């Protein structure tokens, strides 16, 4: 009942980072403190890693196991967006704002950062555990994918949105909003596929799947807290970002057909502001 | 968020199911009381203010010195006697952000609306205190609105040219192309839009000095012009605007159109240059019969006949060109070209369409020259003569380049005051003064044509606003009846004023004797046809005003024959883009685009309801995109029969309309006598 | 040396089925004979069936085994074009020209057809034989992929190009030309990835891989000749189609860095008409 | 494949481990016998050939009308009596593909080498049969090669100008910029390269008529000029080439340099415009001391002092500009700018480097003006005065532009014939005739400066060829000794010929009395120093030739003081690229880039060994990329001390060299008195 409308929405949202000129951010970037620039680079690098694996591994593997040519076409399109559009856009931003050495250093930093490695290990592990014709392993990977789309990106998205909302780094911010617009529909779509599998189960099996989903969310959440503190303490925003990731965790659960898990909190209002041809016939010449 | 912006944003907050239109009066009141009265430079009296403005290089002292200070004080008191109040926030905002004189640091307001109007009236009167008071009453009543250049710059030392529309003929030579680039940069530097005719340039692949395949065509000249207009960006606040016109029978027509394709290569794309196409009746005839057509290489025609292709009658010369072996031509599909034009207009809104035969079958000055192209706004239609710019140390053969200073009658206010005749005559006098005070030092043909032709453009605005505020549908027959009667009266009184000026000054425009005004052929339809309203509702709107009859037109024809006509051109309906807000009037004679105009200024968004918009007249304020473009064409053709120049005619198309719908609209416009089509706007 | 350049060319060639209006083809379709309509339907179904294998298996399997983030992104983009753009385009052409029952029957026939099946299963067999971390098996699959993209499609493309060059079925011919333009670049790109593997091999292993490629080409070519006679004898075109197959076989070989196998032939003109900073050290200023 | 091309390709086929150099003579003989003789039109006699060429609009009949046909026949016999044979295939191929006159269809050959030489000699002699015979002997002996424009176009009706290098001063105004664009287009239409000085244009962000931040800077004018040169690309036969020069102290220097960055945006990037930088000694001094430097806004300086920044002495006025609050300036890092120049030259070979103080410390016409910029080849160094182009109908203040007609001495042939004096004097006469017969009617400053200054450029070629064929290393002290002696003799005889021409015509060049020639300061080093060879081997090379001594230089100084000088500038070593093949010589005074040149003509690859290359002189034909650029700088500085204009100096860099090595080479060249550096070529 939904794939065709998602197909149409995905293809109509198609974009390339080159459509957005980035030289306009040069001055507002120059004006940020060293702490702010450091957090910003690292945040986008963490996002780049997530999209790299979502494009290389997550979306293609889910596409392989989901039945139906139209469902596969949507998932293939989403995969392309992840690595050919999203992951690449971050390099466009980096190449504009930062010198090569700072770019090299931040990519080295992703490799050695323990929270980023842990979250990649956990998510990619679940993708690679999918067994052919085994719907339960597929469900588990789809939960992981929804958590990546609708929860994990948001510790990263906070900062570009926070600046966009203050009228700073608005070209980079425009790119990020386009990425976010895509991930929102990706999270909903994968969520609907996960619910299909969940709804086939006995009540006993469903109870276990909810346990899996909640245990996984909590494990990812605890790691994301440490990641958030590590990045944001130097810019004074860790508590604010934490509220934002909890907000988005609830959206991820909802995408999976589950009740919200965290209590509602006031999000920084700055971040909220950050959000034919037909031929002419002979009679056409007479009136 | 300022208080006035908060009040204005309350417009869209529906209360009781209806928009709170009364919030705009509150919004404008708060805007004034909290920003304008605070940020207005204070002067003890008019004498001190005028002395400060003149001393600080704000006001030119040449025009002010013609009046004794008592006269200036009386004129200023006349301006303030009306107690004029801006009815909506947007009008006052536009005035005090675009036209109100501000200190060099742009932090304080030196001019109120009354001060600006009084200065403009004093500039117009040229020493006549009673004339100045009449101008003050005309503008304060908002019956007549001088164009943005004249209104903003009049009486200002830093002022640019009061004329803003320029048309240049380009001759087929490197000297002429260089001179055209120089003149375009010079005129853009003055802030005026420049339109060039490229139909005389030889097509790509033509020989230069018996060297074949050497010419780069009109697209290389277009790249040069685009770079020149980009360089002369007028401080960059308003990017340099230029238009290039090419005849449809030019060889480079396909390449000329390809410059506006999004898929076009960047080395061919022309970003800052608008393009118009001149379509003779021959092309429409060829497309209608599906016959194969030919595009000609202009230089071969010029060599064969000693005259330019665009200087000849294509309806008489097309067969001779086709049958002449010495003329080089390549085959095209006229219907394919029309479809390409429709597709390009849908994608980018370009090119402008000029129907040459529609323009020239009613042109009064065909003896001087036929109208070969239009301006950047597509409403200027005048005879032009190309110049011959020779080598250095060689005398140049200066031709005639087109220019006109613009003014707009406020139809609603002119009808409310029942002052069509007086308003038209005062506007004609002001336009004549602006024309006589213009002297372009780097456009010899522009200056010569301004001196010889004395062309003026008197437009109109608030047609849709007036009709909606009177219970008349824009597309209805009654709307066309009113437009017919009103613009017939406007033409009658502008012709009468032109003849009276010719009688008083003892001179007509150059080559007036060969014009249709002199021979009387112009007045045939006016002496044979009655243009009084055919509907009682429309006839009542003109009650209290004398509608000229066939006898009145006969008398005017005899008077013109006796005394001649001072202006070669009098009437043209320009878009009137930003000055309509100040007048609280709808733009030009086009139907409104939106009922409520939502715009973002700074970081706060503002809402502008159409003037007079209310629940009772909400349905009469039908948006253009919802309108039948055939009825809009009918209305524009009704108006155009009384306008000697063109009318800026924007096509408002829904996204669901195919290229065939656009082609049919263009074909119906050509069938109905439409001279030019300005833009294809899609919702 | 080449992936970013191909990335650029691929993304700038992006298109969607909806851009070409198909209905005006019915004005020439109605004037074709039964044999012409039959051949066209069968050719179209052949292309559709082969392209589906490439979208579901060929491109995604190569993307899976190739190392390099940028290569995976380009390959993902190509897989997207197969599944989201090409497959929808073929379906659109069919739905325009034939009623539902006729489409189902043609696909039933072509699905059972011996020559179509032989080539489809030969290609799919090589994709299924790729082994993790074995570059030889990957190379063999890449050869199969290049043969599909740059060679096997062309016995089919011939007919739409033949009509397109005559002014018949112009809307569907425009679509086919866009598809063909994508397959050409796909073939060239995968060819470069195969040459990279080939160049890492010993001289004996190279000779062995050359023998593999030529042997595979021979098997496919002999089946193409039979496929060609089966479809084109009824419309009298087989001789010219055979020249077009050999010409495209030579292009496929050149994509793999190999010499042409067949002598140069002219092609049917109707089908042709269709087709080191270092700083100054304060002593450099003294001599 | 042609038989001659197969014979030529046998050059590279090693036989006995040695190149088959004798195969080139066979290649040229086969080329002639099989193509040139076949495709050479046949004429019964010279009278018939001359009639056919004149009537068919191939030759200008005016210059041939000054001789009786007997004299023309004698001149042609003199040219043909030599029985000149091309020594290599490439020489004849280049001549008969570029300079040999061909029928209008480019199918047959109407001119041989002798015919072209005779026509050029008759054009030079201007009606003198003995002088024409002398010119024929000079050219057929290949002692002198007229520049490509003169050689190709002399005596031809459908010809471009014989002068091909022009330098334009641009004043800071819209009129001046538009006139500069027009003049550049007019001059490129003539085939000449145009160099423009942009140092008087105000920098980006300067005020236009007391409105701040209105100026686009030199980059907008650069885009205008680039489009103008692209449009006027010589009918497509040769893309329009122009050069822009900016003083290093101009504020737009970084934006000006960034136009040549590969990563530069297409909006700012300039594609077809060469860029050179004028570096005063002040900038080098600042970079040497690592002191923070300032780049100035030219218009602020002009307003403060009334003069242009490039019209003032930077070495003296830099501190005053820095200390003047009314002069706007931007802090820069001079060493960072130097390194940016080095990196830009490594990546693209730009910009050209002009060392202003090196040029002007020896400039003989500083009273007329300082040298502010160079030409498109970086070897023209003359005083220029900017023109003031005013509004239409106003009088223009025409200044002095720069243009010189070039000719090259063939050093090997001149030394073999022991005819330095005769060759130099005849070349001076021919260049004077070319300058006198030149008249550009669309570049008033160029025409006025040509009439007033009478500037010529007498270059030299085959320095490396002559040295290698004589067993002398290009980098050896003996090579520098020979260059010193030879160019001292060339300068002596060119000065003597200029004085003789001034005496014969009784007229010097405009403002000669203020020149260093008039005051005698020019001859100080020549009267105080000796330039005879210091090596016996070099001294033997000049046997049979009189080497001017200090007494000779004193006599020449007295003669010049008595009679004056006809030419403001006489000597400039241009790159001389295309005609080097015809002359069978190494290009200019630069070392050879490659011993054997591999070229592709169509689908056939041609092999060109360096003229005179053989097994016994292989080591002396050392490639430029393998030489020490310091030794090349030493050679060029030895030559430059006898050239009044500049020497087109290309740097040949290996890919391993860093930007520091390029900077060191530049600094050594500045230290050694180098005036301009042309290109940074990397291998
Ligand atoms: N809508 C408006 N358009 C133009 N000027 C206005 C407007 N509203 C206020 N002003 C200016 O602000 C002044 C103060 O406005 P306000 O309505 O408070 O005046 P007032 O004391 O009631 O009397 P009056 O209307 O006669 O000025 C007005 O005199 C006028 O100068
Ligand atoms: C000089 C030049 C002209 N043109 C075009 C522009 C002009 O419209 C056209 C004519 O150039 P002209 O300047 O008129 O050349 P011409 O008059 O000397 O030669 P002819 O009499 O044969 O025309 O050629 C180019 O495209 N490129 C060029 O370089
Ligand atoms: C008109 C114009 C000038 N310029 C630059 C180019 C000129 O070198 C410089 C001066 O222009 P000018 O033509 O000299 O303008 P002006 O003389 O009226 O103003 P001023 O008294 O200050 O000299 O401004 C632009 O960059 N863009 C423009 O549109
Ligand atoms: Mg001409
Ligand atoms: Mg100026
Ligand atoms: Mn993503
Ligand atoms: Mn996603
Ligand atoms: Mn495909
Ligand atoms: Mn493919």
* Burial profile B365-384: b = 16 or more Cβ within 10 angstroms, e = fewer: bebbbbbbbbbbbbbbbbbb
| CA–CA separation, C237 and D463 (whole Å) | 69
Domain-located, residue A199: yes
Q: Which of C147, C163, C3 lies closest to C67, judged by CA?
A: C3
Whether D288 sits inside 8 A of C279 (CB atoms) is: no
D145 DSSP β-pair partners: D408
Query: How many domains does chain C fold into?
Result: 1
Enumerate residues 222 to 281 of chain A having a beta carbon within 8 A of any beta carbon in chain C.
276-278
Task: Please provide residue B673's backbone torsions phi and psi, each rounded to the nearest 5 degrees.
Answer: 95, 5
- Resolution, given in Å to one decimal, reads 3.8
Instruction: Find out whether B153 and B161 touch, Cβ atoms under 8 Å.
Output: yes
Atom of ligand 2 nearest to the CA of B208: 22
- Report residue D468 as tokens: 């290698």
- Measured in degrees and rounded to the nearest 5, phi and psi for residue D268 equal -95, -30
- Between the CA of B153 and the centroid of ligand 3 the distance, in Å, is 20
Using alpha carbons, list the distances in angstroms from residue C268 to A106, C245, C247. 57, 12, 11
Q: Classify residue A107 by burial, with Cβ atoms within 10 Å: 0-12, 13-18, 19+.
A: middle
For chain C, list the contacting chains (3+ Cβ pairs, <8 Å).
A, D
Supply the range of the domain harboring residue A102: 1-275
User: Measured in whole angstroms, how far is the alpha carbon of residue B162 from the centre of its chain?
Assistant: 14
Pairing of strands D402-403, D165-169: antiparallel
B26 is in an annotated binding site: no
Please give the backbone phi and psi of residue B117, each rounded to the nearest 5 degrees, phi first: -65, -40
Rama region for B494: left / alpha / beta (φ>0; ψ in -120 to 50; rest): alpha
Residue B430 marked ligand-binding: no
Evaluate the CA torsion angle B54, B60, B65, B70 in order and state its sign.
negative
Residue A287 falls within a domain, yes or no? no
> Using CA atoms in the order D144, D146, D152, D153, what is the torsion angle rounded to 10 degrees?
-130
Cα D208 to ligand 3 centre (Å) = 5
Q: How far apart are the first and last CA of chain B?
A: 30
Q: Give the Å distance between the CA of B636 and the centre of ligand 7.
A: 52
- Say if ligand 3 is within 6 A of residue D203 CB: no
Q: Where are the beta strands (DSSP E) in D284-431?
A: 293-296, 329-332, 352-355, 402-403, 405-410
- Measured in Å, residue A253 CA sits from the centre of ligand 6 at 19
Active site annotation includes D379: yes
Rg (C-alpha) for chain D, rounded Å, is: 25
Query: How much of chain B is helix, strand and coil, in % rounded to 5?
Result: 45, 15, 40
Which of D97-128 are b and which e, b meaning 16 or more Cβ less than 10 Å from the residue's Cβ? eebbbbeeeeeebbbbbbbbbbbbbbbbbbeb
Using alpha carbons only, give the angle D124, D128, D134 rounded to the nearest 5 degrees: 65
**CB C22 within 8 Å of CB A22:** no
Chain D interface, best mutation among C280, C282, C283, by max D CB count within 10 A:
C280
Give the per-residue SS3 of chain C. CCHHHHHHHHHHCCCCHHHCCCHHHHHHHCCCCHHHHHHHHHHHHHHHHHHHHHHHHHHHHHHHHCCCHHHHHHHHHHHHHHHHHHHHHHHHHHHHHCCHHHHHHHHHHHHHCHHHHHHHHHHHHHHHCCCCCCHHHHHHHHHHHHHHHHHHCHHHHHHHHHHHCCCCCHHHHHHHHHHHHHHHHHHHHHHHHHHHHHCCCCHHHHHHHHHHHHHHHHHHHHHHHHHHHHHHHHHCCHHHHHHHHHHHHHHHHHHCCCCCCCCCCCCCHHHHHHCCCCCCCCCCCCC
Query: Which alpha helices (DSSP H) does B96-173 contain, by range?
Result: 113-125, 129-140, 148-153
What is the sign of the dihedral through the CA atoms of A56, C61, C51 and C214? positive
Q: Which secondary-structure segment (H or E) carries D417?
A: helix D411-417
Q: Is B16 left (phi over 0), alpha (psi -120 to 50) or beta?
A: left
End-to-end CA distance of chain A: 47
Closest Cα to atom 1 of ligand 2: D189
Question: How near does any CA of chain D get to the CA of B196, in Å?
Answer: 17
| Cα–Cα distance measured from residue C82 to residue C88, given in angstroms and rounded to the nearest whole number | 9
- Tokens matching residue D126: 């201007």
- Annotated domain spans of chain D: 3-142, 143-280+334-683, 281-333
Determine how β-strand D352-355 pairs with β-strand B352-355: unpaired
How does DSSP classify residue D378?
S
Q: Which residue has the tokens 């009449």?
A: B134
Q: Are D658 and C276 an interchain contact pair (Cβ–Cβ within 8 Å)?
A: yes
What CATH number corresponds to the domain at position A49?
1.10.620.20
> Given C90, C127, C147, C198, which residue is catalytic?
C90
- Alpha-carbon span D543 to B507, nearest angstrom: 89
Instruction: List the catalytic residue out of A40, A90, A127, A189.
Output: A90
DSSP classification of residue B197: E
Under DSSP, the state recorded for B424 is H
Which class in CATH covers the domain with range D143-280+334-683? alpha beta
Residue D436 is classified by DSSP as H
Q: How far is A12 from chain B (nearest CA, A)?
A: 16
Print the SS3 string covering D118-143.
Answer: HHHHHHHHCCCHHHHHHHHHHHHCCC
Tell which residue, D189, D341, D316, has the closest CA to residue D258. Answer: D341
The alpha carbon of residue D466 and the mean position of all alpha carbons in its chain are separated, in whole angstroms, by 20
Q: What is the spatial distance between Cα A158 and Cα D525, in angstroms, rounded to a whole number?
A: 75
Rounded CA-CA distance A93/B143 in Å is 55
Contacts of B668 in chain A (CB under 8 A): 287
Instruction: Give catalytic status of residue D572 as yes or no.
Output: no
3-state secondary structure of B672: coil
């Amino acid at each position: 009942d939904f794939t065709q409308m998602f197909y149409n929405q995905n293809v109509k949202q198609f974009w390339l980072p080159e459509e957005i000129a980035l030289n306009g951010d040069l001055l507002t970037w120059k004006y940020l403190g060293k702490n702010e620039q450091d957090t910003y680079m690292k945040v986008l690098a963490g996002l780049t890693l997530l999209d790299t694996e979502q494009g290389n591994t997550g979306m293609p593997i889910v596409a392989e196991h989901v039945d139906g040519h139209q469902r596969k076409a949507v998932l293939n399109f989403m995969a392309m967006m992840e690595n050919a559009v999203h992951a690449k856009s971050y390099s466009n931003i980096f190449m504009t704002l930062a010198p090569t050495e700072t770019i090299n250093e931040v990519f080295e930093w992703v490799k050695q950062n323990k929270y980023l490695q842990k979250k990649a290990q956990m998510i990619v592990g679940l993708y690679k555990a999918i067994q052919k014709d085994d719907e339960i392993s597929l469900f588990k990977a789809m939960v992981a994918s929804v958590y990546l789309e609708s929860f994990l990106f948001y510790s990263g998205f906070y900062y570009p949105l926070y600046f966009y909302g203050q009228g700073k780094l608005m070209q980079s911010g425009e790119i990020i909003n386009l990425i976010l617009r895509d991930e929102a529909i990706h999270g909903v779509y994968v969520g609907l596929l996960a619910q299909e599998i969940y709804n086939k189960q006995t009540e006993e099996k469903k109870a276990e799947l909810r346990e899996f989903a909640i245990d996984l969310l909590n494990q990812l959440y605890e790691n994301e807290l440490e990641y958030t503190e590590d990045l944001y303490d130097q810019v004074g925003l860790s508590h604010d970002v934490k509220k934002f990731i909890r907000y988005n965790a609830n959206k991820a659960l909802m995408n999976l057909g589950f009740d919200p898990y965290f209590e509602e909190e006031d999000i920084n209002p700055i971040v909220l502001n950050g959000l034919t041809v037909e031929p002419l016939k002979d009679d056409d010449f007479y009136f | 968020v300022p208080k006035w912006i908060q009040l204005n944003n309350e417009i869209m907050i529906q209360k009781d199911g209806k928009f709170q239109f009364d919030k705009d009066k509150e919004a404008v009141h708060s805007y004034f009381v909290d920003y304008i009265n605070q940020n207005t430079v204070f002067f003890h009296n008019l004498k001190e203010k005028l002395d400060y403005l003149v001393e600080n290089q704000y006001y030119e002292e040449e025009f002010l010195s013609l009046y004794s200070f008592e006269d200036i004080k009386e004129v200023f008191k006349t301006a303030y006697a009306k107690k004029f109040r801006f009815p909506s926030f947007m009008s006052a905002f536009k005035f005090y952000n675009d036209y109100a004189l501000k200190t060099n640091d742009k932090k304080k307001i030196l001019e109120r609306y009354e001060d600006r109007i009084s200065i403009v009236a004093l500039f117009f009167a040229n020493g006549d205190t009673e004339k100045a008071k009449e101008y003050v009453n005309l503008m304060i009543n908002q019956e007549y609105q001088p164009s943005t250049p004249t209104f903003l710059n009049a009486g200002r030392k830093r002022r640019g040219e009061l004329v803003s529309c320029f048309l240049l003929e380009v001759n087929d030579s490197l000297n002429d192309i260089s001179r055209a680039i120089d003149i375009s940069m010079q005129l853009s530097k003055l802030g005026g839009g420049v339109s060039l005719n490229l139909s005389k340039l030889r097509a790509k692949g033509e020989a230069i000095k018996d060297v074949e395949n050497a010419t780069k065509g009109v697209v290389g000249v277009m790249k040069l012009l685009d770079n020149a207009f980009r360089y002369a960006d007028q401080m960059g606040q308003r990017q340099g605007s230029g238009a290039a016109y090419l005849n449809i029978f030019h060889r480079d027509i396909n390449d000329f159109l390809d410059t506006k394709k999004i898929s076009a290569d960047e080395d061919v794309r022309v970003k800052t240059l608008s393009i118009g196409v001149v379509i003779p009746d021959k092309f429409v005839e060829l497309a209608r019969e599906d016959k194969a057509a030919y595009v000609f290489y202009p230089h071969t025609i010029y060599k064969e006949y000693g005259q330019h292709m665009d200087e000849m009658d294509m309806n008489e010369m097309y067969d001779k060109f086709v049958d002449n072996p010495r003329v080089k031509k390549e085959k095209i599909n006229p219907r394919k070209l029309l479809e390409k034009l429709a597709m390009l207009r849908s994608e980018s809104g370009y090119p402008y369409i000029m129907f040459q035969d529609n323009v020239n079958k009613v042109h009064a000055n065909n003896h001087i020259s036929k109208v070969k192209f239009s301006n950047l706004c597509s409403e200027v239609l005048q005879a032009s003569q190309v110049s011959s710019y020779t080598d250095y140390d060689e005398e140049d053969e200066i031709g005639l380049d087109i220019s006109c200073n613009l003014g707009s009658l406020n139809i609603l206010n002119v009808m409310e005051h029942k002052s069509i005749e007086k308003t038209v005559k005062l506007a004609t006098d002001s336009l004549t003064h602006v024309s006589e005070t213009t002297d372009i030092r780097n456009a010899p043909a522009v200056r010569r044509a301004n001196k010889a032709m004395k062309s003026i453009g008197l437009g109109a605005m608030n047609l849709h606003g007036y009709l909606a505020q009177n219970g008349i549908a824009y597309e209805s027959p009654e709307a066309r009846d009113f437009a017919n009667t009103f613009f017939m009266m406007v033409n009658f009184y502008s012709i009468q004023r032109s003849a009276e000026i010719a009688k008083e000054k003892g001179e007509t425009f150059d080559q007036y004797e060969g014009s249709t005004y002199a021979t009387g052929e112009y007045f045939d339809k006016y002496v044979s046809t009655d243009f009084s309203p055919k509907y009682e509702k429309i006839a009542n709107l003109f009650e209290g005003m004398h509608i000229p009859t066939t006898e009145d037109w006969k008398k005017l024809k005899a008077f013109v024959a006796e005394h001649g006509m001072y202006h070669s051109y009098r009437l043209c309906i320009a878009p009137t883009g930003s000055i309509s807000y100040v007048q609280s009037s709808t733009a030009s004679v086009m139907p409104i685009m939106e009922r409520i105009e939502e715009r973002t200024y700074g970081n706060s968004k503002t809402y502008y309801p159409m003037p007079g918009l209310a629940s009772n007249n909400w349905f009469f304020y039908k948006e253009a995109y919802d309108m039948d473009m055939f009825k809009v064409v009918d209305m524009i053709a009704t108006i155009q029969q009384h306008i000697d120049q063109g009318i800026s005619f924007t096509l408002f198309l829904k996204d669901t309309m195919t290229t065939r719908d656009l082609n049919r609209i263009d074909l119906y416009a050509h069938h109905r006598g439409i001279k030019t089509i300005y833009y294809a706007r899609t919702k």
